[PDB]
Symmetry: C4
Subunit: 33 residues, 4 copies
């Protein structure tokens, strides 16, 4: 169980990092368009 | 085995995050070029 | 304990990768603004 | 040992994802400058 818990928590953090980076990229595409 | 399974699945998620970020970056380089 | 230690260290590295990428993005938004 | 091996390999993949993303960002900052 603990292994699957670690996997789930890292997966969540990856998705959070991705969403935050794409948020800043869209602010840049929004600035230019 | 479960450890290698966790590693393989995180590796996959990393590659997915990378491809998605580079997809949005190319939409931005495409907009400007 | 070692499992939680691995999780904590990967979490730290993710946050470092995110901060560095957002640093370069802001240098780009700064260039254009 | 296997746990530390998994950690080392994910760490490597993170650094590879970061370097590749910053490579594409610099191609974009290079295009505009």
């Amino acid at each position: 169980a603990a292994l699957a818990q670690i996997k789930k928590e890292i997966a969540y953090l990856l998705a959070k990092i991705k969403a935050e980076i794409l948020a800043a990229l869209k602010k840049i595409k929004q600035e230019i368009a």
